[PDB]
Symmetry: D2
């Protein structure tokens, strides 16, 4: 095949996908933006040269990010997303019947406009009256406003030094900006980077341990995302408990979410939060904490 | 970082590993045989241009291939391996104290002799008095010998038309050749190809469904193998039940297996054997059966 | 710099060009047709996954293909092009004031229509009253029409077994079909494939030797084409001598050709027609003759 | 094919060769050193990630670099090489019957040792009593010693800012270090980088113009080197004339060089020094000069 997008995932690992076209290439002051039409994963959003969403498997990422957090809440009504410009986290949140307000707070208007325009899947979401789009740094936005939320969702890029996301994974940020803005019984969830057998030590274990230092209950979980070329991680965090069985998750899904989930049922969530021996022990032994 | 090993996982997806060296390249009349020293995965055995074992994570594959089968057996004493010339399957079998004899039946003497010399991790295994190496087609060997086994392990390449491995995945094979050479309570396990969200439809679902036509109890399961760049699958099959808890499995590990498993504990197996919603249902609805 | 067009020049040599866009991809039943906007070479026409014309250097190929033949002719008035659907060969022919008619005979109407729409450099050429476009196999066309030409231009793909172009490079073709349709003093020129130090043995030496069996005077010549990643070759053939000095050629350029050539002057042609020691001798000693 | 060496030749152009092995990888304080066994070009020396010599076509580079300069001299006896660690420039120089002394002055002992050991072709050269190996910066070595030479050969890497070679292409270096150390009737030749239709403006035109400002007679010439993925350039420079015909070159070769040249005869040299229209005009119009 002639045409390829190439991504260096580590300094010694490259991942190449065959291309149909290069649909749109924008840029803002924040990052490079690109929509590719790829053979293996369909349409793909690439930010600063990292694939961040692919048409074929974004559903897995977005179901996993969103649904566990809301299903463990007794009655989630309002939710604040840090990031979300791609719009699929909002789509999945808006599937919940209890939800009356979703704030998408992304720093990059152009990403939003771009995806608002070209990720057709998210059109019903982007137009729902419950969605409020806010163009800001989520950290500034959070400390600015007094509104408190049932659920806060971190749908940011991994914490990389000198980037616009690193701040929002520090113990400082959690303790003093995020957690004050959680209602009673509030639940936080953040995307947490690679969660492979070896790749999980880069950011996942540290995000987990950083949250461990702020919240009473912390639940790491993971699932394969083919377009990310790895197992990916999320962490639920709360000062209230987080224990539903699979059966109780399935009941809650059937009652509270419109239409059928495609990836996530209760058993899948139970498998997801049962990390492997080595990962589970690695996380437990982690002592690094993100800080100022 | 300018020398790379490349593998086309699909016709539109390439995975590239930075190389330190090319330790050996060659061929038997069956297959090309190469050993690469890679940066991300250490020494990697590449057979017909497909990476089959990487030093850093082969433990995952071989622990998943071997331990669930033997652990589910009350008392496995004799095992036959279809393929296994690389030696790691034998290695993990020989960690079981209950085992008295392992037959490794590989068609290609050069794989065996090459791995016996170059894959040092398996040196003790290859030299264990309990191991018998037979150089033959596994199907011809099983047909021509009356010996029966407590466990038979399929460590062959994926089934396709016309390759030397296809006929060892058929309904007629399992029924007429393999099952008669299982002892009372015998367990079969085979590797079963990619088991990703979409890639599982190639062979994993068909192997599962084929086995489902021959054995009463069939347990498919899967785990990520980074050097294979996908979730990989295995299938257990038996005419006796295959239902142990994570705790039962741990006790058995502790009683029967020399040293600590690096990948697999009881929980990890339960997680591996709980497939995602989509994969589970796809397997259940599969109707392809491999036949002669 | 993460999207790339790749071409395997040989089974062990790849050339990759950074892409701006994929402007079109598709196919007729003859060939795939793609137009890529490349960084190093501008818009590149790719036919069956082989780059055939790049905006930045196609002038070299087409100047070398066309001008030496016409310049050596006392008075070329009518020309037939075998292939030429891309339009650049016609373009450079039509710069000659002496020309009254060009027949462009391409087998693939979709190449013609595509290039006529998308390769703007050739718009005037395509619209010139002197140009006739015929959609046919060039061999069938020449056989079935009595018209004779002062020059015939071979602008076909390289000869191999079974492709649509092979039979237009054979001894029997040149003798029985082409030569009878040359006027008195007629000159044949064909593109002749790679002409590198080693790559010239594939087809360039064989075309030269084949022509040497049919025509009295045969002048092979070559020039670097960066976007082809090699030296490329052409062969002039005639029953009348082909021996002009660099100065004679310049005077003719000045008298007959509208505008300045960007690549070819008289000296450049003399240089191109002086092959290296090794290539010269290899051509002289070649004995393969293409036959039906 | 599985294993590749990748070279970025421009920011938008990559060149990939299939690999047999990575024979040796050294490093010194000056550069990275590597010997690859490549499929398309055989054994290849790579310095700081740039291929600098390949077994299959180094003869072209080294014949072109060496023989024109000596053949234009009436009686060259002693020669100083700036660089030469690879040893092939010395090999070709030592083929001349008039030559009694060759100084190989390379800054990197390890390159020399490495090639002394592993480039078998140059064994007779490296052991010839006329060869003096000197481990130094050629600029310091030149200004240090009083010996004057009939021919000085620049076999350095292209002039790249902040590298150890840039100094040795400045007008200052030429005027005040190099030219004082040329005997009466002395001839200088330097390798001069890419000499393609467009690539020649990077260093070739500037090296040419810089020498033009120091020497009375300057002759640029070029030839394709497949392993360099380009036409490559050299420049002869002298205060005496440089005009032999092809015929006079061939006589001189037959009388003065042992054995047959494989690439270069008199006609080849004449073709080589007949640049194309555009290159010839580009060089003539160059006004940039390398300086302090
Ligand atoms: N794994 C999937 C991750 C998705 S890509 C990261 C997303 O979060 C936004 N973003 C980056 N920094 C941000 C900040 N400080 N505040 C709000 N949004 C931000 C960015 O514009 C982009 O939409
Ligand atoms: N990922 C797990 C695959 C590892 S590679 C496939 C292995 O099975 C052998 N093999 C192939 N066909 C065979 C046959 N009919 N009988 C015995 N061994 C065979 C082959 O020689 C090789 O060692
Ligand atoms: N580098 C110079 C090659 C350019 S690409 C080859 C061109 O010759 C046409 N073509 C192929 N076979 C043909 C035939 N038998 N008759 C007429 N045109 C033909 C084909 O449609 C295409 O336009
Ligand atoms: N196109 C083919 C070029 C060959 S590669 C450049 C060669 O010139 C040496 N070299 C680099 N800088 C040098 C200096 N200042 N003095 C002497 N040798 C040097 C370097 O160690 C190497 O052997």
């Amino acid at each position: 095949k002639s045409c390829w997008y190439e991504e260096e995932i580590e300094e010694n690992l490259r991942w190449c996908f065959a291309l149909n076209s290069i649909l749109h290439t924008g840029a803002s002051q924040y990052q490079d933006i690109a929509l590719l039409d790829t053979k293996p994963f369909g349409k793909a959003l690439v930010l600063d040269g990292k694939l961040q969403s692919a048409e074929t498997d974004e559903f897995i990422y977005h179901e996993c990010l969103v649904h566990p957090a809301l299903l463990h809440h007794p009655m989630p009504k309002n939710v604040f997303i840090m990031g979300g410009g791609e719009g699929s986290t909002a789509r999945e949140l808006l599937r919940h019947k209890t939800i009356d307000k979703v704030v998408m707070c992304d720093i990059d208007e152009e990403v939003v406009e771009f995806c608002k325009s070209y990720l057709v899947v998210n059109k019903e979401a982007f137009h729902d009256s419950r969605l409020e789009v806010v163009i800001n740094d989520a950290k500034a936005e959070l400390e600015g406003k007094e509104e408190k939320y049932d659920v806060i969702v971190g749908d940011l890029a991994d914490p990389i030094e000198g980037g616009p996301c690193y701040k929002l994974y520090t113990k400082d940020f959690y303790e003093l900006t995020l957690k004050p803005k959680l209602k009673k019984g509030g639940i936080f969830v953040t995307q947490a980077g690679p969660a492979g057998i070896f790749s999980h030590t880069e950011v996942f274990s540290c995000i987990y341990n950083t949250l461990r230092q702020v919240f009473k209950y912390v639940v790491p979980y993971s699932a394969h995302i083919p377009s990310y070329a790895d197992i990916w991680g999320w962490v639920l965090a709360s000062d209230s408990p987080l224990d539903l069985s699979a059966e109780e998750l399935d009941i809650r899904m059937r009652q509270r979410i419109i239409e059928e989930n495609r990836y996530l049922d209760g058993k899948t969530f139970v498998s997801s939060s049962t990390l492997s021996k080595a990962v589970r022990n690695s996380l437990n032994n982690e002592t690094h904490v993100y800080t100022e």
